[PDB]
Amino acid sequence: ENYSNTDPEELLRKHVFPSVPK
């Protein structure tokens, strides 16, 4: 059992999702 409980505010800090082309 190696799960995370990640604070989304921080998820959005420590990991920035690149966007797809138009």
Contact residues toward another protein (CB under 8 A) are 2-8, 11-12, 14-21
Distances (CA, A) of 15 to 1, 2, 4, 10, 21: 23, 19, 15, 8, 19
User: Shortest Cβ distance from residue 13 to another protein (Å)?
Assistant: 11
User: Shortest Cβ distance from residue 2 to another protein (Å)?
Assistant: 5
User: Shortest Cβ distance from residue 5 to another protein (Å)?
Assistant: 5
Cα separation, 7 vs 10, in Å, equals 5
